[PDB]
Amino acid sequence: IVRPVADFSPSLWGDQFLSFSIKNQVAEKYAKEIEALKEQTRNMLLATGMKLADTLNLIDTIERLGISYHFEKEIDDILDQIYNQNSNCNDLCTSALQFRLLRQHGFNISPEIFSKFQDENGKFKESLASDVLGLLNLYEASHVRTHADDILEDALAFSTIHLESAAPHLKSPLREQVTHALEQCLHKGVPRVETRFFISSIYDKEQSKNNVLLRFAKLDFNLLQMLHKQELAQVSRWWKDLDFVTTLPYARDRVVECYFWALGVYFEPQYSQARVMLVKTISMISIVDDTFDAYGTVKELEAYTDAIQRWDINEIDRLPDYMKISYKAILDLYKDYEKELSSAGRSHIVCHAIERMKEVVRNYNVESTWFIEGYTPPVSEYLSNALATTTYYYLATTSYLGMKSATEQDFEWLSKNPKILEASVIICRVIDDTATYEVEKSRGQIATGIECCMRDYGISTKEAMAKFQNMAETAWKDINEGLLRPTPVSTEFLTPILNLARIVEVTYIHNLDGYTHPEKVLKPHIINLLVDSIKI
Missing domain, CATH: 1.10.600.10 (Farnesyl Diphosphate Synthase)
Incomplete structure (x- = not known):
């Protein structure tokens, strides 16, 4: 042989x-x-007495930093409250972050939260194209949809084209975050890999x-x-x-x-x-x-x-x-x-x-x-x-x-x-x-x-x-x-x-x-x- x-x-x-x-x-x-x-x-x-936007940002930061496995009880209680209070009166950045965090944790928040950001055709309002933090959070949210979320059919294409356009003129480390996101979305990445990048390349370099x-x-x-x-x-x-x-x-x-x-x-x-x-x-x-x-x-x-x-x-x-x-x-x-x-x-x-x-x-x-x-x-x-x-x-x-x-x-x-x-x-x-x-x-x-x-x-x-x-x-x-x-x-x-x-x-x-x-x-x-x- x-x-x-x-x-x-x-x-x-x-x-x-x-x-x-x-x-x-x-x-x-x-x-x-x-x-x-x-x-x-x-x-x-x-x-x-924290505002909704501040609470969602704190949770999002703790998750990206890779230390949320310490706080599974506390985070669940907070998102469950947010889910049941059903708040629909925020800007695009806070709405898209709310949608993603709840869905990732199994809370079936309605996608009608995005209707106020669209016209009569169901297409996202082009006037939103200059809101970079809103577009980045919409981009990340677009990756968590189910078959019941066709209202978001346009979200990936819309956010991608406008983030591409904006990216070369953004300050750091926001520019590096947007560029990375377009290569690898957060929801489909390997958690330790995404955490290592966020800690060393982004958060370590944030002024705030x-x-x-x-x-x-x-x-x-x-x-x-x-x-x-x-x-x-x-x-x-x-x-x-x-x-x-x-x-x-x-x-x-x-x-x-x-x-x-x-x-x-x-x-x-x-x-x-x-x-x-x-x-x-x-x-x-x-x-x-x-x-x-x-x-x-x-x-x-x-x-x-x-x-x-x-x-x-x-x-x-x-x-x-x-x-x-x-x-x-x-x-x-x-x-x-x-x-x-x-x-x-x-x-x-x-x-x-x-x-x-x-x-x-x-x-x-x-x-x-x-x-x-x-x-x-x-x-x-x-x-x-x-x-x-x-x-x-x-x-x-x-x-x-x-x-x-x-x-x-x-x-x-x-x-x-x-x-x-x-x-x-x-x-x-x-x-x-x-x-x-x-x-x-x-x-x-x-x-x-x-x-x-x-x-x-x-x-x-x-x-x-x-x-x-x-x-x-x-x-x-x-x-x-x-x-x-x-x-x-x-x-x-x-x-x-x-x-x-x-x-x-x-x-x-x-x-x-x-x-x-x-x-x-x-x-x-x-x-x-x-x-x-x-x-x-």
Whole structure:
């Protein structure tokens, strides 16, 4: 058997993450001061007799600074009051901020709040074009709409064209904020990534900044970063000890990039165990992917798929030596999960992740069959197979394992493929398909998404990519609707699914595959979140 030649770039990080020794004197000093600053900030939130505009701005600033996870109760109480008082008598800036903050927190505020800013045709009044702070907040709001919000159909186009026009003459750091916003909206960004930018590039440079909030945000970011580096060091040692870098050299070595994905799903300290479990799964399923895509023969892949369905160490002998390596590591990993969840009495929930893993591998094997046979399915059949091979049903299920408050009922809801999950999966599928079309096309893949779409509808590549872009827009509207109260499960279990969709948008920005090619997209983010501290 002549296997194909290896083409993936090596890990660009070497061993720089493998050892991190926390300085306990500094961590304890930071924690002590943060406790003091946390209370000052709580009192700012609970202050009586604030005007609406000032209250919304305080909440928005605390959220962008990345410290709102300390004040979930206080912020919820305030927005719930604002929602029920239903105030509709403010300028564009305050109205658009009100709309976005309420919708992001699940309060279904009516979009009729914008009618006073439009003419008889439902088009925004052009006289608003000189109000830059109003336009910026309208721009950010336009990204949180559902299918019931067609009154906002024009908001993105209107605000974009006039912010573009105004930007070159704005003072700093407003100019940098507007420019950044036009490249990456707040609602679809990765929270730690957006926070790092706002703290260092914008708030640190505002003349009017609150010194208490800024010091709090810097110390908190840097203290959480120490924990993230300990976790990554622990995961790096785990990866090193497995040594797939030398025994399975055909596969991508990307454990740092996998950790960035897990950090995007949740960053808070209470999800430390969940992050470490999630990153080990992403790493391991990535090995399996490479095995199907660029090494194993048709016959070997059939054996691998059947052995996964049986999930039994007795099956290893049916497999080639190199496949024995990964099969045993997979079975071991889930045994580790069961043991790790044992003192909390939650060992039994591991089977949910295992069943989603079997589904991914079955569909990998179908994808391989289609390739060898030269089959181009209709779009409906393509999607019935290819949605699972995003791995996103599996990752969402895995993200719940280390969450102590997740119950059997939560897994039951997820297992039925609810709408919000189906939407996040669709976004991953169609964005990856648009980004990777030309590459896979040169490698002879006749069953690529854009290809199936062109043959099915009988349209051009350009038209097919546009149809896929519409599918993604429909899916974002479905995610936004899925966050609205009453929710079918706690909001705690919805945010990971939203954050999986945000990771798609950030990774394939400017239409390029960032995970296989971390140099352009992901490398700057990894440096800013895991190498460089914020200077105080």
